[PDB]
């Protein structure tokens, strides 16, 4: 049973949520190889764990930059959640630690790169291609939401592809354990639900709206609401009007009208039947949900892979030192990390 699987998953989660792992490695245990990407207050690097020779991705956050961007509480949420969750399409936090300057989160390496990169290059995905990725997100949200977690950062840039062509969700900077409404304006303009834009209290329904944006973007090659400035994107999002490419199937269009639905009483994911409104929708009729979870479905795209720490599926980023001050920065703010 899904419900029973989730019951047990929650017991596993809560034990770790209530007693988080802390200080489980040190920078000197890793050989830094290549920057895999950047953010406003951090970077992710491919590293090699010396004692095992395993490769990992190491997210490095500058504590001073975290503070200036008012992301202290959000960063503590990310680490606390990531260390407690367990799901095939989430990257396990293997280790975490901090030093005078930085916060460090070490997770499994996904050599296939970002969906974003392949999506833009190839232009768009076929409906079966998009559906395969979509199903993994549906299952991942079903899992996270059952734990009272809201995700809030869904976009192709943050969907990593593994060696078998399956998805890894890795970035939990906006993820929050909340049973009620929440209010933080956060996420990516193109992916914001109307509720967020309108400064309402919102809940996990915003993730199901974001799923609609993602499926649209995956199948069209561009998002449903775009413009040159965020303000113009927000006006499109709130106006309540989406146009579909003529090549979209009738089932795809009907799924999207129900995900990209401004009315919360009608948005799929949000109703009485919850996630089953989505799973049992006609566009997903060919989906074997169990087979997707078990990773027995053949990925329609499987990545070029030459060696263990090969990075050809990632863009090239300027390499910058990892500097560690001789003074501890922001000790109190990050005490629990």
């Amino acid at each position: 049973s899904v419900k029973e699987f989730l019951a047990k998953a929650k017991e596993d989660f809560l034990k770790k949520w209530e007693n988080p792992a802390q200080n489980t490695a040190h920078l000197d245990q890793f050989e830094r190889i290549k920057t895999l990407g950047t953010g406003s207050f951090g970077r992710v690097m491919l590293v090699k764990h010396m004692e095992t020779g395993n490769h990992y991705a190491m997210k490095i956050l500058d504590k001073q930059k975290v503070v200036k961007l008012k992301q202290i509480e959000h960063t503590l949420n990310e680490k606390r959640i990531l260390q407690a969750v367990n799901f095939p399409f989430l990257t396990k936090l293997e280790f975490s630690f901090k030093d005078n300057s930085n916060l460090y989160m070490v997770m499994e390496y996904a050599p296939g790169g970002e969906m974003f990169s392949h999506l833009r290059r190839i232009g768009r995905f076929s409906e079966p291609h998009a559906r395969f990725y979509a199903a993994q997100i549906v299952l991942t949200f079903e899992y996270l939401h059952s734990l009272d977690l809201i995700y809030r950062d869904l976009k192709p840039e943050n969907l990593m592809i593994d060696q078998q062509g399956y998805i890894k969700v890795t970035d939990f900077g906006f993820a929050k354990r909340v049973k009620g409404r929440t209010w933080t304006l956060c996420g990516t303009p193109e992916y914001l639900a109307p509720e967020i834009i309108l400064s309402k209290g919102y809940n996990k329904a915003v993730d199901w709206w974001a799923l609609g944006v993602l499926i649209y973007e995956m199948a069209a090659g561009y998002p449903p609401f775009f413009a040159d400035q965020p303000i113009q994107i927000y006006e499109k999002i709130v106006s309540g009007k989406v146009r579909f490419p003529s090549h979209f199937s009738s089932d795809l269009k009907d799924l999207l009208r129900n995900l990209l639905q401004v009315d919360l009483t009608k948005r799929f994911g949000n109703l009485k039947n919850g996630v089953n409104d989505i799973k049992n929708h006609k566009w997903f009729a060919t989906t074997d949900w169990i087979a997707i979870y078990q990773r027995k479905v053949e990925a329609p795209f499987i990545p070029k892979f030459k060696g263990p720490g090969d990075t050809s599926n990632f863009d090239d980023y300027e390499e910058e030192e990892i500097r560690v001050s001789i003074n501890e920065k922001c000790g109190k703010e990050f005490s629990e990390f």
């Binding site: 974003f116 906006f174 304006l185 996420g187 303009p189 561009y222 413009a227 040159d228 965020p230 490419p245």
Partner: peptide
């Protein structure tokens, strides 16, 4: 075309999060 407008737009590259 809508694709042509997207490709010519300033938001085909990686999109940053907003923080408020």
């Amino acid at each position: 075309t809508t694709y042509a407008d997207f490709i010519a737009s300033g938001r085909t590259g990686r999109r940053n999060a907003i923080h408020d």
